[PDB]
Amino acid sequence: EIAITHHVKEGHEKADPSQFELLKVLGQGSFGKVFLVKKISGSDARQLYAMKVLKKATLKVRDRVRDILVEVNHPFIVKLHYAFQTEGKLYLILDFLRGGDLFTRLSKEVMFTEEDVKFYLAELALALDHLHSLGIIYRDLKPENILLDEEGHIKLTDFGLSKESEKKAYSFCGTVEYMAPEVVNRRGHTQSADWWSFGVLMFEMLTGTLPFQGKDRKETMTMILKAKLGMPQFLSPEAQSLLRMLFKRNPANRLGAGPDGVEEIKRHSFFSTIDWNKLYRREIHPPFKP
Ligand SMILES: C[C@@H]1O[C@@H](Oc2c(-c3ccc(O)cc3)oc3cc(O)cc(O)c3c2=O)[C@H](O)[C@H](O)[C@H]1O
């Protein structure tokens, strides 16, 4: 069943079905049945949203890590604004994403080159850093968290998404393959854990394989902690360099962990061709158009 993790903002106003007016019912391909609704009251009164109703899903609510700012839209993020349960149903109120699709659906269809990956990772880097500024730490950022809009640009979900099944429940069940060593350790971690996951995403985009993978969770964990990564030699020196710097096991040494954070990554030679201002303005075309 789907577990949805809602990272609630500081002054969040709780909601219920009565705060929303139904506008339309849509079939959105990979998104299934989506209701278009309008918020009736509150700070966001009159705002249009998508609503998903999930029959059998669990909701986990988590605090973000800490001026009085009202949030505005980021070009490469879709947000979960409200999540609430009723008589056996989970309601999700989300940014409306017309004609959206799954990154996975695209990764299964194409063979990415380094040039392709530069675009997607650059948009993802902007999104991830923005979430960090909002106080969100992903932990197990993975391809399931990555959508594409109708124009083919990245939309990173600001909410967690996972599959959970005599068996005891856990507050955090993450996909091990994408977790940093310090996360697997349960010893404590920061947003620098997510830059490791970013590297895993990059490795998988470039190679179609995961860098650390065992026969079972236990083994994969051992590999993340101790395995010597065999770096694919077909990768450019710049790609190899970026991956090695993201796959530092001691988070203090990992690219993106310094005071400048994402800037350490933006400055890396792998991304030298990217104009970050043009990118943010959505003035660079995606390599693949759905
Ligand atoms: C919660 C998800 O809702 C639906 O897909 C959507 C997703 C999504 C799909 C697959 C993923 O791996 C992650 C997310 O995201 C949305 C984001 C929005 O801002 C608005 C939406 O309507 C969906 C949206 O309708 C689909 O029903 C998915 O099966 C379900 O898991």
* Nearest atom of ligand 1 to the alpha carbon of 92: 1
Catalytic residue among 95, 140, 149, 194: 140
Closest CA to 201 of 247, 235, 132: 247
Q: Quick one: DSSP state of residue 127?
A: H
Query: 185 and 225 share a domain?
Result: yes
Helix (H) or strand (E) holding 238: helix 237-246
Query: 89 and 224 share a domain?
Result: no
27 labelled ligand-binding = yes
28 labelled ligand-binding = yes
Active site residue 16: no
Structure tokens at 222: 């051992």
> In angstroms, rounded to a whole number, what is the distance separating the alpha carbons of residues 44 and 46?
6
Ligand 1 mean position to 97 CA, how many Å?
Answer: 9
Structure tokens at 150: 């109708």
Resolution (A): 1.5
Supply φ then ψ for residue 50, to 5 degrees: -90, 145
Ligand 1 mean position to 154 CA, how many Å?
Answer: 14
Query: 93 and 103 share a domain?
Result: no
Q: Which of 2, 5, 30, 31 to mutate to test the pocket of ligand 1 (most atoms within 8 A of CB)?
A: 31
Ligand 1 mean position to 208 CA, how many Å?
Answer: 23
33 labelled ligand-binding = yes
Query: 161 and 230 share a domain?
Result: yes
Query: 85 and 105 share a domain?
Result: no
Domains identified in the chain, total number: 2
Supply the range of the domain harboring residue 89: 1-98
Ligand 1 mean position to 100 CA, how many Å?
Answer: 9
32 labelled ligand-binding = yes
Which residue puts its alpha carbon closest to atom 8 of ligand 1? 31
Which residue puts its alpha carbon closest to atom 5 of ligand 1? 31
Query: 120 and 189 share a domain?
Result: yes
Residue partners of 225: CB distance under 8 A and separation at least 6: 181, 184, 185, 249
Supply φ then ψ for residue 214, to 5 degrees: -105, -175
Residue 261, helix vs strand vs coil: coil
Burial of 18-42, coded b for 16+ CB within 10 Å and e otherwise, reads: ebbeeeeeeebeebeebbbbebeee
The CATH number of whichever domain residue 135 belongs to comes to 1.10.510.10
Query: 112 and 238 share a domain?
Result: yes
Closest CA to 145 of 231, 87, 76: 76
